Design an enzyme around this catalytic site. Structure first.
Site, PDB file in Angstrom:
ATOM      1  CG  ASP A  28      -1.964  -0.899   1.158  1.00 40.82           C
ATOM      2  OD1 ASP A  28      -2.083  -1.845   0.193  1.00 40.82           O
ATOM      3  OD2 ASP A  28      -2.782  -1.100   2.260  1.00 40.82           O
ATOM      4  CG  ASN A  49      -0.978   3.457   3.610  1.00 39.60           C
ATOM      5  OD1 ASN A  49      -2.300   3.993   3.663  1.00 39.60           O
ATOM      6  ND2 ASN A  49      -0.857   2.545   3.613  1.00 39.60           N
TER       7      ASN A  49
HETATM    8  O1  LIG Z   1      -3.749   5.040   7.056  1.00 39.11           O
HETATM    9  C1  LIG Z   1      -4.208   5.816   7.697  1.00 39.11           C
HETATM   10  C2  LIG Z   1      -5.190   6.778   6.914  1.00 39.11           C
HETATM   11  C3  LIG Z   1      -4.561   8.304   7.210  1.00 39.11           C
HETATM   12  C4  LIG Z   1      -4.534   8.900   8.519  1.00 39.11           C
HETATM   13  C5  LIG Z   1      -3.315   8.393   9.350  1.00 39.11           C
HETATM   14  C6  LIG Z   1      -2.436   9.469   9.965  1.00 39.11           C
HETATM   15  C7  LIG Z   1      -1.558   8.846  10.514  1.00 39.11           C
HETATM   16  C8  LIG Z   1      -0.631  10.026  11.074  1.00 39.11           C
HETATM   17  C9  LIG Z   1       0.849   9.317  11.849  1.00 39.11           C
HETATM   18  C10 LIG Z   1       1.619  10.686  12.365  1.00 39.11           C
HETATM   19  N1  LIG Z   1       1.459  11.628  11.883  1.00 39.11           N
HETATM   20  C11 LIG Z   1       0.051  12.167  11.240  1.00 39.11           C
HETATM   21  N2  LIG Z   1      -0.102  13.258  11.138  1.00 39.11           N
HETATM   22  C12 LIG Z   1      -1.108  14.276  10.676  1.00 39.11           C
HETATM   23  C13 LIG Z   1      -0.895  15.474  10.518  1.00 39.11           C
HETATM   24  C14 LIG Z   1      -2.056  16.412  10.160  1.00 39.11           C
HETATM   25  C15 LIG Z   1      -3.240  15.710   9.582  1.00 39.11           C
HETATM   26  C16 LIG Z   1      -3.334  14.421   9.613  1.00 39.11           C
HETATM   27  C17 LIG Z   1      -2.272  13.416   9.972  1.00 39.11           C
HETATM   28  N3  LIG Z   1      -0.955  11.275  11.023  1.00 39.11           N
HETATM   29  C18 LIG Z   1      -1.279   7.451  10.621  1.00 39.11           C
HETATM   30  C19 LIG Z   1      -1.982   6.741  10.129  1.00 39.11           C
HETATM   31  C20 LIG Z   1      -3.400   6.898   9.511  1.00 39.11           C
HETATM   32  N4  LIG Z   1      -3.993   6.199   8.917  1.00 39.11           N
END
Ligand SMILES: O=C1CCCc2cc(-c3ccnc(Nc4ccccc4)n3)ccc2N1
EC number: 2.7.11.1
Length: 252
Positions: free
Chosen positions: A132, A137
């Site tokens: 993925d 991701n």
């Molecule tokens: O696969 C997905 C769908 C997308 C959301 C997501 C986000 C994080 C993550 C990890 C570390 N920093 C951040 N920062 C962040 C900063 C601003 C907005 C959104 C996320 N986000 C990890 C896993 C995850 N799951």
């Protein structure tokens, strides 16, 4: 190897929905260290039969250390839930950036592609493939550097969907898909149904808008071959003319 517990964190803003719970900003109480906490429901891991898939990915992801790979610091569980302690990526997902900007210029794309390739080259030389490699991701650090995380066909190569044998060449196909999506704003095998997308991938039917330059067409075309053996090595990608002309960071 410190065994953690929820009481060692102050949880904050929801960062996203991960399809298996949600990822939250959190701060470690003792140190004040800011990180991200992925919250998974144990009952939804049994009943999607991925508990192995989690354990092995967590093992792999903990040992890997690269500037363009999101760090997994650790994990813990209670009764209901499992917790992944992750690097926090201040600038969010590549997905969101792409939603905002609709598409990326050649410079931003070529930079991203470098950063990916680098983090993949490293990944391969520890016998780690990925599947993925998709915008949902990929995250962005404070400096706006790409970070891979989260160890639907849209990004899967022909050999994989077909059910054939696959090697580290899957990730090369992914780069081509992403390179295309970054420039065009949608992946090259996109459709309205799964069945159709499957067809598009399997016969490798993609076309380029006028605005996609000859150099990018070249690199994408090279990456999206049916035959894995015909796709270039990562080194060749980092040394593609279009890449070196347009990137910002260097290759490694
Ligand atoms: O696969 C997905 C769908 C997308 C959301 C997501 C986000 C994080 C993550 C990890 C570390 N920093 C951040 N920062 C962040 C900063 C601003 C907005 C959104 C996320 N986000 C990890 C896993 C995850 N799951």
């Amino acid at each position: 190897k410190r065994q953690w517990a929820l009481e060692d964190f102050e949880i904050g803003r929801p960062l996203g929905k991960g399809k298996f719970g949600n990822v939250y900003l959190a701060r470690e109480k003792q140190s004040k260290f800011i990180l991200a906490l992925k919250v998974l429901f144990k009952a939804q891991l049994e009943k999607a039969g991925v508990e192995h898939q989690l354990r092995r990915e967590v093992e792999i992801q903990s040992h890997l250390r690269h500037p363009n790979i999101l760090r997994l610091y650790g994990y813990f569980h209670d009764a209901t839930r499992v917790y992944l302690i992750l690097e926090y990526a201040p600038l969010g997902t590549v997905y969101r950036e792409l939603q905002k900007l609709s598409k990326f210029d050649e410079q931003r794309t070529a930079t991203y592609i470098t950063e990916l390739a680098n983090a993949l080259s490293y990944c391969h030389s520890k016998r780690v493939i990925h599947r993925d490699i998709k915008p949902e991701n990929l995250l962005l650090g404070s400096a706006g550097e790409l970070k891979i995380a989260d160890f639907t066909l849209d990004y899967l190569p022909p050999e994989m969907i077909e059910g054939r044998m696959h090697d580290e060449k899957v990730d090369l196909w992914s780069l081509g898909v992403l390179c295309y999506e970054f420039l065009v704003g949608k992946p090259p095998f996109e459709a309205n149904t799964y069945q159709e997308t499957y067809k598009r991938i399997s016969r490798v039917e993609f076309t380029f808008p006028d605005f996609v330059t000859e150099g990018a067409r070249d690199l994408i075309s090279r990456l999206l071959k049916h035959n894995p053996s015909q796709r270039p090595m990562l080194r060749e990608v980092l040394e593609h003319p279009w890449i070196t002309a347009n990137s910002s960071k260097p290759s490694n």
